Curated annotation (Swiss-Prot), chains A, B:
The record's note on its domains: The [IL]-x-C-x-x-[DE] motif is a proposed target motif for cysteine S-nitrosylation mediated by the iNOS-S100A8/A9 transnitrosylase complex.
Cross-link (Glycyl lysine isopeptide (Lys-Gly) (interchain with G-Cter in SUMO1)): 27
Motif ([IL]-x-C-x-x-[DE] motif): 312-317
GO biological process, one term: negative regulation of coagulation
Gene (name only): ANXA5
Chain positions found as N6-succinyllysine: 288
Superkingdom in the source lineage: Eukaryota
Disorder named in the UniProt entry: Pregnancy loss, recurrent, 3: A common complication of pregnancy, resulting in spontaneous abortion before the fetus has reached viability. The term includes all miscarriages from the time of conception until 24 weeks of gestation. Recurrent pregnancy loss is defined as 3 or more consecutive spontaneous abortions.
Chain positions found as N6-acetyllysine: 68, 74, 77, 95, 99
Subunit structure: Monomer. Binds ATRX and EIF5B. Interacts with hepatitis B virus (HBV).
Modified residues (Phosphoserine): 35
Record's protein name: Annexin A5
Cross-linked residues, Glycyl lysine isopeptide (Lys-Gly) (interchain with G-Cter in SUMO2): 27
Keyword Calcium: yes
């Protein structure tokens, strides 16, 4: 009855002993990648921050700097991602995505659609603290269309509270959504944006069910997952996140490794950002919806120290 | 970093609708065992109590009475066990085991060794409320030897709190335990009983480790698990519960189905009593220590509606 990650506080945690273990793993010309990945994936993010502090006090060096030069490639990127303070991770990912003409719209859609209003408020505050500009201003300056508008409405974090059901409002909203979809989501955008972005989660779940009975198909089938534009991809992410945030992020992981190549940025981002929130539930939705475990997918697509750290973050194989 | 069972509160729970579902499953000459086991194993124990209350209000019948006549065999016993209020289950199991000359010492040892001081205090209060006789008097009246004495000390629920380590006391207690074991646990029983029963869990874990270095073998190997008397079986249960309560109860499940025949009473008791506390960690310990999942063991040894309900209580297969 609760969300659950795969990483928890290590019992009997001694930040000074862990700092010594990590320094022993890199002092000298050699490296003990196994010791580094085993310790860091078994300590919580808060514990990693205390290790980094004890590391600086004991040895007068910077742990993150040492890891960046001692490690390489995707393994380095994963370890560096795990060391980023949890409170800063999403704000950092969004700022990195906001790239003017080269903006990574997948990251904007992923984070803004799947984070709760509480999380988005914290992100907006942290974002201004770290970068001196508002997240909304950066998004507006770097996106266009009603994709921009829907992101702005979601960033407002003003979603209705899970209150009593209103079947009269569940009929009219579902009627409106059926009709915006009939017009290919290119008409009256502000109205379906207000429905997708401000109605309560429990309400929209009933609206999506009422959409089934009115239309004969689920609302997701009005949007092609591969060829649609940015707004449509955001609507799909919002719909799936309304149904289940773990299921949306599980599908995000699935398509990160499906087919030729691997989207390692998305793989690292989802496993790290959700490791202490709902990665266990993501694993369950993954096994149910794609007939194979997240563990087996990671094992088949990745290699080296990078793979073992990802498998330890995944925690277990699912059957 | 938390214990976790396999059964949680059903979301959107409606006790009147569930009562109607259960009545629909037994009204008439037929029975829908699938509907009964699917609903009852997916509702928490507290929710089952509200279903039974709504059942009596809606229909003027007793749900437990209806289940007892509609179901048979081990399936009936499992469903009846799940319906017993959680607050009463251990006290009922102990009273049922306290049978004078036919006393079931395995149940006494299992519950009293693996329950926390907090749980034991609740059990003692409930036991008096339901049966009019303190739990200690019945235990003393139906047990003998220093097995009786060690149970009484454990029932006192006065174990030292997890405080700061004392390596000097960890040397002396382990010396004393090594020496009681050298005398086959038949000398100065009150002295190792005080150590096993009143020292803190974290202290005894260090004592058990210090016992390794002093003796060269773990303390469990001074007791044959199959031929040992009642006191020795209790010492083994206490030692294993000090190391890990989930691991002790996992081993209890393993030997409940190992070999010829099935100890269905123990199987039902552990799965039900630990369904909303630590059955998930029991499943984990089971897979590591016995190279096979609890799911696979239940599947291979049980049958019918009884098996299905046990597998749903188990939750998932472990891999
Ligand atoms: Ca919130
Ligand atoms: Ca602004
Ligand atoms: Ca709310
Ligand atoms: Ca009947
Ligand atoms: Ca308590
Ligand atoms: Ca013995
Ligand atoms: Ca299932």
């Amino acid at each position: 009855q609760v969300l659950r990650g795969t990483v928890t506080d290590f019992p009997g945690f001694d930040e000074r002993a862990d700092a010594e273990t990590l320094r022993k793993a890199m002092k000298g010309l050699g490296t003990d990648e196994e010791s580094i990945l085993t310790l860091l994936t078994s300590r919580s993010n808060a514990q990693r921050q205390e290790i980094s502090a004890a590391f600086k006090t004991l040895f007068g060096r910077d742990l993150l700097d040492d890891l960046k030069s001692e490690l390489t490639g995707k393994f380095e990127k994963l370890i560096v991602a795990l060391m980023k303070p949890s409170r800063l991770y999403d704000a950092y990912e969004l700022k990195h995505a906001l790239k003017g003409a080269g903006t990574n719209e997948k990251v904007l859609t992923e984070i803004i659609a799947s984070r709760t209003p509480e999380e988005l408020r914290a992100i907006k505050q942290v974002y201004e603290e770290e970068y001196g500009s508002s997240l909304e201003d950066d998004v507006v300056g770097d996106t266009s269309g009603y994709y921009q508008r829907m992101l702005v409405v979601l960033l407002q974090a003003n979603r209705d509270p899970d209150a009593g059901i209103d079947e009269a409002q569940v009929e009219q909203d579902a009627q409106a959504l059926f009709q915006a979809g009939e017009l290919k989501w290119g008409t009256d955008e502000e109205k379906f944006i207000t429905i997708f972005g401000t109605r309560s989660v429990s309400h929209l779940r009933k609206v999506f069910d009422k959409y089934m009975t009115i239309s004969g198909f689920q609302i997701e089938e009005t949007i092609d997952r591969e060829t649609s534009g940015n707004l449509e991809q955001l609507l799909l992410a919002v719909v799936k996140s309304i149904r289940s945030i773990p299921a949306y992020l599980a599908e995000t992981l699935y398509y990160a490794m499906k087919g030729a190549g691997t989207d390692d940025h998305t793989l690292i981002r989802v496993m790290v950002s959700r490791s202490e929130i709902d990665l266990f539930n993501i694993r369950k939705e993954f096994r149910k919806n794609f007939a194979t475990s997240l563990y087996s997918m990671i094992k088949g697509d990745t290699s080296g120290d990078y793979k073992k750290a990802l498998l330890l973050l995944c925690g277990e194989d699912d059957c």
